[PDB]
Amino acid sequence: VSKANVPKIDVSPLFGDDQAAKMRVAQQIDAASRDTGFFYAVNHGINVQRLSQKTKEFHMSITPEEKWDLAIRAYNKEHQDQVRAGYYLSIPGKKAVESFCYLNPNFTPDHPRIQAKTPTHEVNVWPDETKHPGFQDFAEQYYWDVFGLSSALLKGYALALGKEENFFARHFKPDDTLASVVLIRYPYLDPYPEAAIKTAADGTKLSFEWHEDVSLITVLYQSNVQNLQVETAAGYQDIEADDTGYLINCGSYMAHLTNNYYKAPIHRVKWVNAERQSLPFFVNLGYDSVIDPFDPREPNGKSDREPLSYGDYLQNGLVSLINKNGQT
Ligand SMILES: [Fe+3]
């Protein structure tokens, strides 16, 4: 199995006003997006040591009682309003992964999308402050820290495609973004439950099967344990780990609006028996956000693809992904 070319891109110019330096970053983003589809963002300014530490404290200290109280509807019939946000339980002996998902902290009962009961909008659920002091504060802060990095990355993608730098970012707003953070624990288990290991067609043992991401872009921090593979025409290639950088890829909404010029890379998660974290931030726009599709290959950029509302895209995509790769 070969190793994927995943460049490390210094994204710091995207926070500045040196326009030529931003263009040189955008060229590297373009090149990566047309190759394997992945790159590492380095010099990003986020304290990822604190993120990993606080996440570890939470996963290791939460109890079965608390997990039921926080569980999404798939695990607790009482929580009919929690489809996205909450705890995703492991099943001892059957399912190893567990995770906690939270959404825009601005989604409160006062928010009009919550008042209207618009699909995909939910109010976050949190553990008791006294049992997990500082966790909610850290998690909400982190949402806005990674929001800020993601805004900057969206400027790079816009420039890469020959658009003005706010082309995507103007639709990525703190008041309505459907973006999510997922705090995923992959445990060390001995013996490891065979039910939690899938066998790929090529024989590889997997924790999560091939998929395209449901996102505009995905902004991922992982601990330093190699696990990801990307599909190329010549087969799957290993993505090397880097626990100081963020791993970035496009989701299927980017592929739609660029007429597959920037594809959403197909990728999968190898089984590795090691305690590790996987902390994605899924960059989603607003429920009514629409970007007119275009084709960067054409002189006039004309595309015959229908504009797709981001909310309808996200509702369909989240359900499709559960149906194909299983309830996480
Ligand atoms: Fe993915």
Curated annotation (Swiss-Prot):
Keywords: Antibiotic biosynthesis, Cytoplasm, Iron, Metal-binding, Oxidoreductase, Vitamin C. N-[(5S)-5-amino-5-carboxypentanoyl]-L-cysteinyl-D-valine binds at residues 84, 88, 180, 186, 211, 213, 278. GO terms for cellular component: cytosol. 2-oxoglutarate binds at residue 276. It is found in: Cytoplasm, Cytosol. Fe(2+) binds at residues 211, 213, 267. Residues 173-285 form the Fe2OG dioxygenase domain. GO terms for biological process: penicillin biosynthetic process. It catalyses: N-[(5S)-5-amino-5-carboxypentanoyl]-L-cysteinyl-D-valine + O2 = isopenicillin N + 2 H2O. Pathway: Antibiotic biosynthesis; penicillin G biosynthesis; penicillin G from L-alpha-aminoadipate and L-cysteine and L-valine: step 2/3. SUPFAM superfamilies: Clavaminate synthase-like. The keyword Oxidoreductase applies. The record marks 208 as: Transition state stabilizer. Belongs to the iron/ascorbate-dependent oxidoreductase family. Monomer. This is Isopenicillin N synthase.
